[PDB]
Ligand binder design. Sequence first.
Ligand SMILES: C=CC(=O)Nc1cccc(-c2n[nH]c3cc(C)ccc23)c1
Length: 296
Amino acid sequence: TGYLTIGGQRYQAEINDLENLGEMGQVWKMRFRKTGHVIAVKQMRRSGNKEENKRILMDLDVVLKSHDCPYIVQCFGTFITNTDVFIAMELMGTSAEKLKKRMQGPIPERILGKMTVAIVKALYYLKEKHGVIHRDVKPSNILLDERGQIKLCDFGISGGCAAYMAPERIDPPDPTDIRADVWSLGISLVELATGQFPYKNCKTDFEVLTKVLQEEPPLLPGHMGFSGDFQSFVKDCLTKDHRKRPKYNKLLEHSFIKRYETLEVDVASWFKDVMAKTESPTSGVLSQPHLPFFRH
Ligand SMILES: C=CC(=O)Nc1cccc(-c2n[nH]c3cc(C)ccc23)c1
């Protein structure tokens, strides 16, 4: 028997109840028959990889504690059987990674403003309330849905990848903190605002690390019509010396965040449009043969 809190109520449920609508891991899309809620149900097999299961349970632990942060995907409850743990979670629409890939181009600044409010408050909550330093902020961990909601993902939420790593995580100016995540947020925002990841030509992880340290920090192009506010926020996030890079509390007073705390933005529509538009309908194209051998 599982115990679900959803829809304002408390339910005692049999894992069997849940109508399976298919895999989305392993994560299943499932309908709770008693209410009509559609949810994501994560399956942790008792036999599974011991490292995966460790991370899943750490993440789960932080999520169970985070009911009062509106910017983190919520857990509705759990079921424990002899062979599994099933974890009922809020079902979103997509990760911003998927969304950038579907669109093949930029996310409008107004959507990214609402996104920055959400994600900075999520990260700050985690540090202030639970001592957690997320360490893996990237567009695959930013989730959106058709209600217009933008939340930080449970995956890795309990606290890396070369592309979003800050200078001080590669070579700190003194060996022997959340500002590394502020950098990753910056890189994420430049990537999504442009549709181009800032270190695209890199063919290896070490090469990426090299650009981070040797090159000027990436910027929002000054010619695309991003607001002065947005350019500043990104520029602050991408401060190479972590010692002068702002903490979340300072970011939360920044004009970019502050304006988008109350500016009306209809993210639900923009989301619905973009998902309809970019549905691949039919228009399938035969793939090209490999180039045959040739002697030059
Ligand atoms: C990187 C892509 C991605 O995460 N895509 C995606 C697309 C649509 C919904 C979710 C999602 N919503 N709620 C979740 C809860 C868990 C535990 C995992 C994924 C999701 C995730």
